[PDB]
Amino acid sequence: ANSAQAKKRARQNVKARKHNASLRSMVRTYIKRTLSAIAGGDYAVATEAYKKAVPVIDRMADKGIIHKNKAARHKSRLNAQVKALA
Amino acid sequence: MVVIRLARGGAKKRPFYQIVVTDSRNARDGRFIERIGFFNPTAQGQAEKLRLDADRFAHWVSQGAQPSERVASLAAQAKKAT
Amino acid sequence: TVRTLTGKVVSDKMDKSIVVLIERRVQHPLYGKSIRRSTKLHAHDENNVAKIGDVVTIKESRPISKTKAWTLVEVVEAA
Amino acid sequence: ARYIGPKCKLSRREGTDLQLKSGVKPFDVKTKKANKAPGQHGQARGGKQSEYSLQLREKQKVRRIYGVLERQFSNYYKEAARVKGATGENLLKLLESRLDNVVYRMGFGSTRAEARQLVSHRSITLNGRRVNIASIQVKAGDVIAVHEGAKQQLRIKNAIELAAQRGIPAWIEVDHSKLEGTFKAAPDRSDLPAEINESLIVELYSK
RNA sequence: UAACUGAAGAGUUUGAUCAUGGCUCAGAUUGAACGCUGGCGGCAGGCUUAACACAUGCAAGUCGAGCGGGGGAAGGUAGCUUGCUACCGGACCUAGCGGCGGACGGGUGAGUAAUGCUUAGGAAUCUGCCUAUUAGUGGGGGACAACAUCUCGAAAGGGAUGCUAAUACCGCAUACGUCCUACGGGAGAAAGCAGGGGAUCUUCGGACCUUGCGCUAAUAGAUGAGCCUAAGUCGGAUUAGCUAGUUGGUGGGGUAAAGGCCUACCAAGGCGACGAUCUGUAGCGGGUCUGAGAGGAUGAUCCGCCACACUGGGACUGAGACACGGCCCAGACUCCUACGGGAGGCAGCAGUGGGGAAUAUUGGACAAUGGGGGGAACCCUGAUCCAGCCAUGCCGCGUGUGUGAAGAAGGCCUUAUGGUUGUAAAGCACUUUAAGCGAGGAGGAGGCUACUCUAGUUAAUACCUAGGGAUAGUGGACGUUACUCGCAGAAUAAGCACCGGCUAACUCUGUGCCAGCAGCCGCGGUAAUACAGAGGGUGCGAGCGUUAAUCGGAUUUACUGGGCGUAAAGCGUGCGUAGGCGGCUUAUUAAGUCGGAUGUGAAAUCCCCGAGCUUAACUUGGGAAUUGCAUUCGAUACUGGUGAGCUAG
């Protein structure tokens, strides 16, 4: 970087990268937990996992970490797979 | 945004402006959406000095176009004249 | 209000997919003689009604696969 | 650039009076060497010429009286060919519409060179404005007057009295007392001398 | 009114001739170069070669009305070595956090024969700032730069401990819209700052009211971008088979979004003589040059699209990048070093080296038009507007005008005295364009501030917003502007090519197949109109010639528009595949063909009629044109399809 503002932009970039990466890993972990419950196959367990996963997905969608279309797709597909367990 | 502004043409020391509606990110004398008049600051004799299409101006302003200072002054002067 | 083409089927092996041959007649740009040209278009046929040799109509639609963007409308003549 | 030099050899080569001198003396008494070409190998008028020689010799004669060079003359031809009408008639109209020629024919200058000098030295006004370009095209209904400082010139008074010997043309009306004149319209071919042939120029430039 | 009107040949094969057929010449044009010469102005253009390497300066900042610190000026108050000190409130400045911008504007054409471009359409998308409308902006918490200490390094810059503010960050509460839904229900936000103030209170300094700028959720509009389809878009067969995520399907994953985009299975498909695969070359279009047209060549300067940023591979932040002057990695190269450690990318503007036949200043201002930030004041802007250099091009002007012959002098030729230079010169009388000197002097500036008035919002006259009026200030880099008026005196200002024919313009000297000229045919071997000089003349003219390149002439690739007995050219002769073409009558279809309507065919460019430049170049208003494409409605003579019938093949 040649200019002070460019250097400042790089600094803010690395900070924001760290913060966003942590927030995105959280959503990935919760979706993984719901998928594991689905694989386990108990309807109540899968329902609890889905009910715990949904608020985190919506919160991180509202912050711009992920797109709201992606959040809606995740919610719909997970709900369908849970309902499949009867 | 969308703006209404002046694009320069003519010869050296004798500018002649077209009044254009365009995206602000475009180059001054490049891509534009619609041309709605002209301005000649040094008109002489029988030459017209300012033509402006008031209905198109109003229609584009109603959609959120932002005139520049010079274009707004010219529009006010044209409305005063006619 | 939708673009349609009329052709003849030249293949039906693929599942839910048919290949139809379109033909057109144009004048040569320089020498003026009328020339015939052919185009092979993949189409979507959900119920495998079409077979080799029938005359079919197809209409433009959104992509279905890598190479298919047209869908069958009706069978005009049977083989 | 304008031609400068001897005018009588110029006229002798073409064989006809080109009106390049004031005219206080006739051409024959002026030169004494007419019908002889300027060169030592110069011969009589009866020398045979090819068609290419004839077309060239006519165009040169037409250029030499008006004092126009080749670039401007070719531009004149190209404009006359574009304008609808007879090409030769249009070319003659364009040549006779120049400001210096109108000043000469109005009698404020003894010769076209005098008229050109007067126009260039800002001694002429066109429609009330002092101009200095000899090739300005004069339109119908114009007013050419002598500038105030230009007035009371002995050369101008000699020019007007000399012009009195000739005939003031139809399209130009002059108040010589006020040094003022009014071009009305472009001469038609009948007014101009009939010895000039323009067809030769036409195919020469349309080759 | 108008928008077009357009076509020339010559030389050369032979002792003549006609034909065939090449070669050469006369035209237009240029981002040109070189030789000789050179006065001015206007308007344009200016590294086509090394996408070769780069010294140095500039080309992206702004906001204290988001925030905490920290500085240095003044002032006021106190004292007194008396004009010095110490204290206190306001006015200025900004290293850091934070917001917006940096994805625009500018450069280049390496790569790319189709993921690109052009024309016409489509559905499954997102979109900061702008416009309209709807619902809100409640209450908490934990941190980290700055700062302080220590430490490494000459530094440049690094590292480690302890604090701190916010429109930085994260829970909780609430939800007109919004998301999911099994239709029962469940889920998800935000931030404050500034101006003014009547009354009231003020736990003592604000609350409260109001108006702006903000922030959150959502729907439309506009703008921008992503995706898909059809038809077009340069050669090569001395390149004939190519393809296994390959072609299709199902489950799942993934994207803003359709989709083998990815993945696990199932099947064996997909492309190709209408040229697949391989290979050479190349940015594409509007346009430009040429041509009677059809065509051919081309893609500088202007505009649209695409791609690239020392060479390759990636991702982050963000509404938007896989980002020229951002980050990471690998490679080559270059630089500083105290050897500890570091740094860099002109195909941005100017400029250097190198290459080349060849292409310019290390300039001025943000006054104008735009762009970024800001409430404003204002700051930034090598975009831009201007200036400098170059006859590179186009257009215009000047280098003087009239008179002046028993034809001065001098030069050249000669039939030896005439001819010619030539009115040319001298002499006589005049004029002052442009350049030079002096004086005056538009327009490019709309506006802003000050004053006053009116109308909105309010509780308000305050503040803010929108308007009106007159006056006064302030605002131009170009610039000693354009333009106008005075002074001087012809005074400051012409070259280049050619004269056997093609092709306008002829003699004498000098040399003798020598020296030399030459586009083709050809000149020179003692009378050279063709070599060199001189006299004379011709053509152009601040230019004139040569070389290079494209089209034309070339009907010399012939679609318009050519040929094959002997000039070049019928396969040695059959059969036959793909293909091309195909007898008569009738009914029907409307693919070819023809007609109407609608939409589109950007602007600029070409042409026509006008307007403004003292004229012209040039600029500009409105038309005409863009010969095309798509959709839709009609006609049925001919061609094609289908049904029926016939016999001359």
With 0-12 / 13-18 / 19 or more C-beta atoms within 10 angstroms meaning exposed / middle / buried, residue C43 is buried
Bases on strand E under 7 Å from any protein CB: 4, 8, 39, 42-44, 60-62, 95-102, 104-106, 121-126, 128-131, 169-172, 179-182, 186-189, 217-218, 221-224, 227-232, 247-250, 252-261, 268-272, 274, 295, 302-305, 316-319, 323, 325-327, 344-345, 368-372, 383-387, 395-404, 407, 412, 419-425, 429-434, 443-447, 467-468, 484-486, 494, 503-507, 535-542, 559, 580-581, 591-593, 602-603, 608, 611-616, 618-621, 631
C29 neighbors C42 (Cβ within 8 angstroms): no
Supply the range of the domain harboring residue A50: 1-86
User: By what technique were these coordinates determined?
Assistant: cryo-EM
CA of D79 to C1' of E29 (A): 20
- Give the total number of structural domains in chain A: 1
Tokens of B16: 């002649």
CA of A29 to C1' of E124 (A): 30
What stretch of H or E contains C9? strand C4-11
Angle formed by the axes of helices D51-66 and D70-82, to 10°?
A: 100
D63 neighbors D95 (Cβ within 8 angstroms): no
Distance between CA atoms of C59 and C20, rounded to whole angstroms? 12
Query: Which nt has its C1' nearest the CA of A14?
Result: E316
Domains contained in chain D, CATH given? 7-95+192-206 (1.10.1050.10), 96-183 (3.10.290.10)
D74 neighbors D205 (Cβ within 8 angstroms): yes
Backbone dihedral angles phi then psi of residue B4, each to the nearest 5 degrees: -115, 120
Q: After which residues is chain D broken (C to N over 2.5 A)?
A: none
All residues at 6 or more sequence positions from C34 whose CB lies less than 8 Å from its CB, including other chains: C25, C26, C27, C28
Reported as half-sphere exposure (CB side, CA atoms, 13 A), residue B31 has a value of: 5
* Domain definitions of chain C by residue range: 1-79
Distance between CA atoms of D179 and D118, rounded to whole angstroms? 14
* Unique residue bearing structure tokens 């001198």: D21
| Helix residue spans in B1-82 (DSSP H) | 54-62, 69-81
Which DSSP state fits C28? -
Q: Which chains touch A (3 or more CB pairs under 8 A)?
A: none
How many Å separate Cα B74 from the centre of its chain? 8
Q: Which chains touch D (3 or more CB pairs under 8 A)?
A: none
Q: What angle do CA B37, B40, B44 make, to 5 degrees?
A: 130
Print burial letters for C47-61: b (CB count within 10 Å at least 16), e (below 16). eeebeeebbbebeee
Q: What angle do CA D29, D31, D34 make, to 5 degrees?
A: 105
Distance between CA atoms of B72 and B69, rounded to whole angstroms? 5
DSSP characters for B37-52? Answer: EEE-TT--TT---EEE
Give the dihedral sign, CA D55/D60/D66/D67: positive
Within chain B, what is the greatest distance between any pair of CA atoms? 38
Give the dihedral sign, CA A41/A44/A49/A55: positive
Tokens of B44: 């002489």
Distance between CA atoms of D88 and D197, rounded to whole angstroms? 9
Distance between CA atoms of A50 and A41, rounded to whole angstroms? 13
Residue B10, classed as helix, strand or coil, is strand
| Helix residue spans in D1-142 (DSSP H) | 8-14, 27-31, 51-66, 70-82, 87-96, 99-105, 112-120
Q: What angle do CA D187, D114, D29 make, to 5 degrees?
A: 90
* Domain definitions of chain B by residue range: 1-82
DSSP characters for D141-183? Answer: TEEEEE-TTTSS-HHHHHHHHHHHHS---TTEEEETTTTEEEE
